[PDB]
């Protein structure tokens, strides 16, 4: 069942920076015209000048609020005659309200069904869905809890434990408690950030696993019941639980084991009829794996999966949202035939100063010379000679990927 109005001529990206440029490039390659949105303070962003047209949004608001201005973004889509909105990642890309209103305005939302944003946007509902699909999860509170249900959990399962917000993202709604006193403190502070950053503060707890790998599986689902995985990614290289370097495939794990992980992700996505791009995230410890999250959108590290499979994930997203069949029209092979070529690594180069506690630097870029060659892929954010890095947005300058037959 394909929604009415799935044909596209023009697409608008409700985002900024590298991901917006990435989506425009796919659109242009598909013969779609593009529309950008920008906050006043972000007016020198590359993504603004890569679109076929662009519009200021969020007048008079703080810059991040401008990018979260649902009504104003919809206003631009309708005024420009866009057919579709691609939300990128971050910002409103997992936001049920936004997708609902985009669809209610007769536009295509390039992403999964509302039902999927609801159950995978909420991490409690997501663990429920994973249990239902018979995918092993991490022992955790039955649902959301007050501090007494939390302490109860720690009594049942033991310290240490991970305090997690239902709507946590990037790592902002989570705290490790190795203690009673850290449980009271951690719980309070995870609830604050969750209200502050995402407007609601529901909390659950999970068993905290020691020295795990973080392994995640890329999924595509279409509107014709096809689901496939594009192998996995190892994102274990983290700082303060934030991804720094990602690789693909997971070269330090056995192919049988990786395959098992991929099949578990597929099982879950089949069970709920997942549509469009999504990722299933697992923690891995001694040849066991545990479900933690689904990100029901594209991710920053999709790039490395494109390189080892040959599949253009963003193009796929857009074609799926146009109602196309993964195999028949988009041209992906059967699952056993998905390529697995070499390995790939992605680093994000930022203005974070490692000798100043990773505080991101600001100011004007005097010189920007980008390398190339065989096995190099660059997806630029805001970096060019003359560009003024502001304090308002993330510190990303450019994403660098390398790819080769051998990991070394």
């Amino acid at each position: 069942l394909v929604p009415r109005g799935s044909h596209m001529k023009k697409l608008l990206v409700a985002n900024r920076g590298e991901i917006a440029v990435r989506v425009f490039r796919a659109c242009n390659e598909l013969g779609l015209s593009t529309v950008a949105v920008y906050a006043r303070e972000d007016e020198y962003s590359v993504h603004r000048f890569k679109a076929d047209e662009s519009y200021l949004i969020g007048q008079g608001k703080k810059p991040i609020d401008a990018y979260l201005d649902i009504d104003d973004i919809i206003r631009v889509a309708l005024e420009s005659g866009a057919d579709a909105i691609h939300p990128g990642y971050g910002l409103l890309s997992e936001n049920l309200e936004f997708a609902t209103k985009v669809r209610a305005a007769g536009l295509v939302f390039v992403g999964p069904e509302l039902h999927h944003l609801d159950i995978f946007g909420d991490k409690i509902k997501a663990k429920a869905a994973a249990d239902e699909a018979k995918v092993p999860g991490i022992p955790g509170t039955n649902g959301a809890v007050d501090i007494d249900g939390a302490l109860e959990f720690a009594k049942t399962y033991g310290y240490p434990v991970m305090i997690k917000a239902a709507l946590g993202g990037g790592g902002r709604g989570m705290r490790v408690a190795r203690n009673d006193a850290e449980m009271h403190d951690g719980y309070a502070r995870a609830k604050s950030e969750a209200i502050g950053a995402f407007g609601s503060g529901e909390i659950y707890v999970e068993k905290y696993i020691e020295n795990p790998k973080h392994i995640e599986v890329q999924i595509l689902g279409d509107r014709h019941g096809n689901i496939i995985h594009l192998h996995e990614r190892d994102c274990s290289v983290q700082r303060r639980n934030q991804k720094v370097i990602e690789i693909a495939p997971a070269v330090g794990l056995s192919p049988d084991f990786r395959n098992e992980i991929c099949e578990a992700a597929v099982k879950l996505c089949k069970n709920v009829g997942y549509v469009n791009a999504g990722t299933v995230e697992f923690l891995v410890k001694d040849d066991k794996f545990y479900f933690i999250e689904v990100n029901p959108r594209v991710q920053v590290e999709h790039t490395i999966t494109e390189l080892i499979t040959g599949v253009d994930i963003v193009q796929a997203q857009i074609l799926i949202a146009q109602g196309k069949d993964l195999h028949r029209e988009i041209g992906l092979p059967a699952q056993s035939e998905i390529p697995l070529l070499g390995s790939a690594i992605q680093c994000r180069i930022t203005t974070e100063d490692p000798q100043n506690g990773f505080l991101p630097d600001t100011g004007k870029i005097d010189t920007y010379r980008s390398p190339g060659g065989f096995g190099i892929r660059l997806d630029v954010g805001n970096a060019y000679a003359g560009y003024e890095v502001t304090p308002y947005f993330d510190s990303l300058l450019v994403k660098v990927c390398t790819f080769a037959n051998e990991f070394s």
Binding site: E29, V35, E43, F49, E53, L56, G386, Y387
Partner: protein, 655 residues
Amino acid sequence: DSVRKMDRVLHEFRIRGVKTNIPFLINVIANENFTSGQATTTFIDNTPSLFNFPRLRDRGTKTLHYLSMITVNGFPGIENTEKRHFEEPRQPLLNLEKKKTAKNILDEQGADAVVDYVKNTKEVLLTDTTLRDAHQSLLATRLRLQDMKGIAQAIDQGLPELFSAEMWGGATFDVAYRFLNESPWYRLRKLRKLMPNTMFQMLFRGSNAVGYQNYPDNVIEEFIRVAAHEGIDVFRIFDSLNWLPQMEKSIQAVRDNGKIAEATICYTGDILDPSRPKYNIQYYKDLAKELEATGAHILAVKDMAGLLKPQAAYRLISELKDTVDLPIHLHTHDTSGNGIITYSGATQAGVDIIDVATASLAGGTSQPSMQSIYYALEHGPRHASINVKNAEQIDHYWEDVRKYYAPFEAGITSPQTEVYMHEMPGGQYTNLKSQAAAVGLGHRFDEIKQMYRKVNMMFGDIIKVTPSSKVVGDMALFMIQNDLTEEDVYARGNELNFPESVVSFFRGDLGQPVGGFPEKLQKIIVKDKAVITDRPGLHAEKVDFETVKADLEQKIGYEPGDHEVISYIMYPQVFLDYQKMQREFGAVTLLDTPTFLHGMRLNEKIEVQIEKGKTLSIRLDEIGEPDLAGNRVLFFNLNGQRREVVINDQSVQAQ
């Protein structure tokens, strides 16, 4: 997909400062020989279509050329001064009421139904002249579309009670092209869309539309057809000498196009001065009856010099209302300081509609204030029909916008009762001031106003409105400049070359004046040139729209719309000069007014909206010093790129 990616990449490259082979590569990968995979070693050498390269558009660069021009050399005809920091104009806080408007009625039921709506209205109705006559009087007609658009929706929604908005014709057509480098047709379309419920009114000269040549009838008819199609609802048709034959065809064509025709009587003299009986109340009644017989929908009284005193307005209107059944639409200027009281008088006499300007563009040589007449009638038997609180809010925007036009201000806005003595309408007064300057008689202007008055009597006492007012001016100037009395002119005129405009007047090129010409003086002035006594347009060189259209397309390099064709016919050189300016500077209409007039300051950033979805973010980073040949180099940032622009500094060159 590999081919699509190449194509994406080639288009995405930005390389400036040297030419590249990119446009050739783009052609190669577009071709079917390449995409099939079947190309051979001889493919390129035998495919000449690969060498056709499109001209790639550069709006950005014409903009920087214009900004650099104004920044360095100033705006022509005004003082080259440094640009003030202007706040955004205030937007109004409206209390909207939804009502059916005259425009709605015209479109749903036609013109006669509008006339009936007017007859049944007890309140005096208002036409807003803010978009046309008010700035023609106060700001040398320089008000720009860009400023008009920012408040137009507010006027439409805000003041649905308006009979109409006067927004076109008079000097606006010409000035828009010639001095503002913007098309009056684009102004009409843009405002038309923003104001769908407001009747749009224009001033239209019966024989010439908006021009000053002698056009044949088919031109006048075509102008009307296009204007009407493009959104003009009410045509106020006048003739400079109140000569009815000049008006008849126009009136018929407006009716034929389904629009409203006001037939106009120009007021002059004083119906209450029995020593000037030539323009007495009977004159006006007689002419009003003839105008009624043409089938005009409304009678307009155009008091172009603001001569009408309140007792005369009362007598005139009351008599006219007992002479014809058409609604009467009165137009005056506040030049004497008696505009409100005259309108209030006319209201007591039954007047149906009056022409008013928003307060901040009212008074002086403009129309009386809209907001003021509301309050003058608030406690009388007849109110003015307007949402005054909304009108006051909207006035804020115009108060702010007016400050941008400081360099074009005629002087301080205050009364001038000497208009009763000389009878110059306002433009004639300011223009005649420039002319006496350019000839070094600025110091004798008061002798000139005195001569203007004498000349008027010498010519038989005439109606003075454009272009007949100029006829009187040129002569009066001539006569002072060559130390001539009226006696001198009658004695030794046979050996003098009189000014062009005077000669043309006395040949009948402006039509026939009331009471004919003074005979001896006519002979003296016209000498051996051809004199006519019938309608000048009967003598007009024929005009074939297909010929002219082809001629024009050749000249501008694309197929002109009907509106362009008629512009070219109306003002040929000006239209061609506008085209050249578009080609050099692009669409300057899109610039905010202070930028249009003064360019940019060092370290200033501006945003130019060049299209829906396209904005030029422009910052001026450096203004280099001129070298000895005048070369200056400015450095801009345009949408994150450094741009180096060379402009020639005229002050050095003219050293």
